[PDB]
Amino acid sequence: SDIFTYGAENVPAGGLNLELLSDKNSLIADDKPREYLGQQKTAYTDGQNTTPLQTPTRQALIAFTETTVFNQSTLSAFNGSIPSDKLSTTLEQAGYQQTNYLFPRTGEDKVWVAHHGYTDYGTAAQFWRPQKQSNTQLTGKITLIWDANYCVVVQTRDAAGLTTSAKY
Amino acid sequence: DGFGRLLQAAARHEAGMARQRNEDGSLIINVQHTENRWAVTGRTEYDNKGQPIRTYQPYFLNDWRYVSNDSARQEKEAYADTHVYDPIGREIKVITAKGWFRRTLFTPWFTVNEDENDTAAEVKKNIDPKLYQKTPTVSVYDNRGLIIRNIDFHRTTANGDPDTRITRHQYDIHGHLNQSIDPRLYEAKQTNNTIKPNFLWQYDLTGNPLCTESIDAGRTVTLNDIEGRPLLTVTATGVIQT
Amino acid sequence: LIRKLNTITSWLHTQKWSVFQLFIMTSTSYNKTLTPEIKNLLDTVYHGLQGFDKDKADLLHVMAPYIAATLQLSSENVAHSVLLWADKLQPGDGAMTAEKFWDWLNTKYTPGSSEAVETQEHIVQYCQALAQLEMVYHSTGINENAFRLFVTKPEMFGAATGAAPAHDALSLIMLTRFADWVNALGEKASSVLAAFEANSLTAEQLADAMNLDANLLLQASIQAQNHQHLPPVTPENAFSCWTSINTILQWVNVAQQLNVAPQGVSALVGLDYIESMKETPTYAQWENAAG
Amino acid sequence: MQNSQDFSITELSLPKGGGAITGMGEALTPTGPDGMAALSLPLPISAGRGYAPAFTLNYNSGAGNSPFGLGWDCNVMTIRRRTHF
Amino acid sequence: SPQARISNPSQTTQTAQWLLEASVSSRGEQIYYQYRAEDDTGCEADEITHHLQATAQRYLHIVYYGNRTASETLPGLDGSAPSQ
């Protein structure tokens, strides 16, 4: 997702519509000053690998989601106040990672993203229920123990071994 | 009600004075002592859409059973506010038990909010109400639906010529608040361009402020890790906290 | 006068223009006034005239972006041509061109006020004139490039020539024919306008843009170059002057209505009666012409 | 919360009671261009594991008779030969 | 299966309708729909006399869902009658 800003003087009489916008010289045409708002990616698994798949499987098991948090121009926000090497280091420690644009253009570098919403799924023999969950890689995973019929979760366990359970 | 909305609720209290529920559910204003006493609260009539239209003040009742609405609407002392809504579902006017009211005018670019003093002159049949004539609070929007100006009107006497006091706001490309200016400083800025906004903000792409700067409190910078919990921050005084 | 009316009124009737619309576009009365309809442009031109260095800056590049907002969406290039035009035309009482903006309007005018040195009145006339060319652009339906060419090289179109075109209703007809022509060229219009500004446009190339049999365009050019037309037509400018192009296309259009292939049109032209040159036609000419 | 998932399962918390009585759903349908009156009622179908039959009982003026009484349909998915022509 | 069909009572290959009989999800869950055929119980002689076949109608009788055993296939294959 990007954004353009134009002045009042750029609104063609009659307003915008598809025929005008699809034009090669339109306000959304290429070679325009698009500002970047952010991008997202869905990472899929097969319930066996930790390495994400190139394409999803039939079950659409989502491994995690990727979101851009900082562009090179937004890291400028820190107004220095941190060494530049310290900053990239800090961001790595914080769980941010540098990658490319999903829908790249000529003329841009890597951006920092967060990975989150991690789910480890069980197998097909089981109804394909999530077995373990985490907001991210900075913390531990909550174990989900499914009942005999994989209908409800019977017992949950936190990363610390702290455990709750329920009868239904 | 049959739409699942709360009409009212009541709690049991200790013996004391209460309004009385008659045999047919009629409300009797003249209170008597009773052992069985409940406090009625949250009593509301609706317009069949679910926009509360008549909302009542709490009272004690010598019953737990619901009071009839044909009765409550006629007692007058069974105080309530009246809420008048437009076709959009927004409140237009709210009339309280005192006869005083609030009123809001909506236009495509701004909202004019009149309080009970602004309207005091219209409920005439204390503070000389002339003072609040034409002094509503006006919220002015941009074309993204964000508020960019707040216009107040200022008089210190009923017969004065009201000033205009405008607080300005600007939003960035994600609609986050980028900066704000106190009207005192604003006018000063127009004379001396080296003047900063009262506040400035810098955000990451998820809308977390990373930085803020204030003419009253200096500049701070914060880095949170991906779970949102803070990892590193600096105070205006340069204290680094991790 | 009656033929002038047949020429202009029949034209207004197919262009769907009223006389009043023509009048406001062609009147050069340029009322010296500063009501909001005028003030609204002056109030933003000041940013252009105050934030730029006039001895380094090209005023057309400085002002075109502001008039773009006060004019109805005049793109910088249309706005550029709108100013370039006024500067060459001097659409006011005196030599009223954009430079008065740097010396008086952004100094004495005092932005936001109409109480100022009388130069501000000439500024009004200029600004109204810019609006008139704008109305012409939109009422004409002329392409952006098609439009700048009448300002850039006015001679080629029979415009004021020593200046960008005056709002002469007769010129508006000619200026419009070019607009109608680029619309006829359609998607090919941009290769033609470039070739046209250049001396490279010729026969066949235009015919493709005009969807014509190149040979009819070609022999039409040949007659355009042999018959004495109000403008002279010689191969050197046969396709560079709009006026030469209209001469040629008319030889094509007539041939089409007569179905005689332009040389065959000439055959029916040299058949005169009250001929001031006393070139009494001979029977052979009438005979061949009939054939 | 950003950088969190909407399918997170963190609690085995119990439901609360009391509150307002909603009764059964009664979807008096906001129909438009067809002009017909219509009403949907939910059926007591347990979610089960999360893959329950998607049934509802539907009134549609003009529907004709049925196993559920005049005007109401079963709303079961079928494939049928076209008889309109 | 025959119960999932509405067909000409004599020319039973002439299926008018194919009713949903079974479904499976990508996650291995299943639903099986058991239909009951129209019969004459509960009817008087007059009805029986006039509508001699009239066995064509089907009614949804039991929907079986929440398979105890995970499976990727449709529960109706091979014509196996459902069992609780």
Residues B4 and D20: beta-carbon distance below 8 Å: yes
C-alpha C60 chain-centroid distance: 19
Q: How buried is residue D4: exposed, middle or buried, by Cβ count under 10 Å (0-12/13-18/19+)? A: middle
The length of chain A, given as a count of residues? 168
Residue of A nearest to D15 (CA): A168
d(C-alpha B122, C-alpha B104), whole Å? 14
A160 interfaces chain D, CB cutoff of 8 Å = no
Residues A41 and B177: beta-carbon distance below 8 Å: no
Which token pair is A25? 């010289």
Number of Cβ within a 10 Å radius of residue B123: 14
Number of Cβ within a 10 Å radius of residue C149: 22
Q: Give Dmax (Cα) for chain C.
A: 77
Residues with Cβ < 8 Å from C103, sequence gap 6 or more? C119
Chain D, 10-49: which have a CB under 8 Å from a chain B CB?
A: 19-23
Q: Which residue(s) pair with E36 in the sheet?
A: E59
Name which of A8, A12, A13 is nearest C69 (Cβ-Cβ).
Answer: A8
Task: Count Cα neighbours of B152 within 13 Å in the Cβ-side half-sphere.
Answer: 8
3-state class of C286 per DSSP?
helix
Q: How far is CA C120 from CA B175, C83, C85, C112, E9, in A?
A: 41, 17, 20, 12, 97
Number of Cβ within a 10 Å radius of residue D57: 16
DSSP string over C193-237: HHHHHTT---TTHHHHHTT--HHHHHHHHHHHHHS--SS---GGG
Residues with Cβ < 8 Å from A5, sequence gap 6 or more? A35, B173
d(C-alpha E61, C-alpha A76), whole Å? 67
Q: After which residues, if any, is chain A broken (C to N > 2.5 Å)?
A: none
Angle between helix axes C242-258 and C214-226 (nearest 10 degrees) is: 110
d(C-alpha C117, C-alpha C123), whole Å? 11
Residues C255 and C216: beta-carbon distance below 8 Å: yes
Q: Which residue(s) pair with B32 in the sheet?
A: B18
Name which of A70, A78, A81 is nearest B205 (Cβ-Cβ).
Answer: A70
CA nearest to C67, candidates A100, A43, A8: A8
Q: Which residue(s) pair with D60 in the sheet?
A: D38
DSSP A67: E
State in Å, rounded, how far the first CA of chain D is from the last one: 56
Q: Which of E27, E31, E69 best probes binding to A when mutated, by most A CB atoms within 10 angstroms?
A: E27
d(C-alpha E30, C-alpha D49), whole Å? 10
Phi/psi at C83 (nearest 5 deg)?
Answer: -70, -45
CA A9-A13-A17 angle, to 5 degrees, is: 105
Phi/psi at B110 (nearest 5 deg)?
Answer: -150, 160
Q: Which residue has the tokens 């008549």?
A: B54
Identify the H or E element spanning C79.
Answer: helix C76-89
CA nearest to B42, candidates B81, B84, B70: B81
Residues A27 and A16: beta-carbon distance below 8 Å: yes
C73's torsion region: left (phi>0), alpha (psi -120 to 50) or beta? left
Type of residue at E1: S
Q: Which residue has the tokens 């409550």?
A: B72
Residues of chain A with a CB closer than 8 angstroms to some CB in chain C:
7-13
Which token pair is E63? 């929907």
Task: Count Cα neighbours of B56 within 13 Å in the Cβ-side half-sphere.
Answer: 24
Q: How far is CA B192 from CA B178, B188, B189, in A?
A: 21, 6, 5
Q: How far is CA C104 from CA B41, B196, C47, C65, in A?
A: 73, 33, 14, 20
Number of Cβ within a 10 Å radius of residue B167: 17
d(C-alpha D8, C-alpha D5), whole Å? 6
Q: How buried is residue C143: exposed, middle or buried, by Cβ count under 10 Å (0-12/13-18/19+)? A: buried
Identify the H or E element spanning C8.
Answer: helix C2-15
Q: Please tell me the distance in Å from A84's CA to the nearest CA on chain C.
A: 36
Task: Count Cα neighbours of B183 within 13 Å in the Cβ-side half-sphere.
Answer: 12
Which token pair is E75? 């529960």
3-state class of A85 per DSSP?
helix
Phi/psi at B8 (nearest 5 deg)?
Answer: -175, 165
Residues C116 and C78: beta-carbon distance below 8 Å: no
Phi/psi at E3 (nearest 5 deg)?
Answer: -75, -15
Identify the H or E element spanning C145.
Answer: helix C144-152
CB contact under 8 A, D20 and B227: no
CB pairs under 8 A between A and B: 68
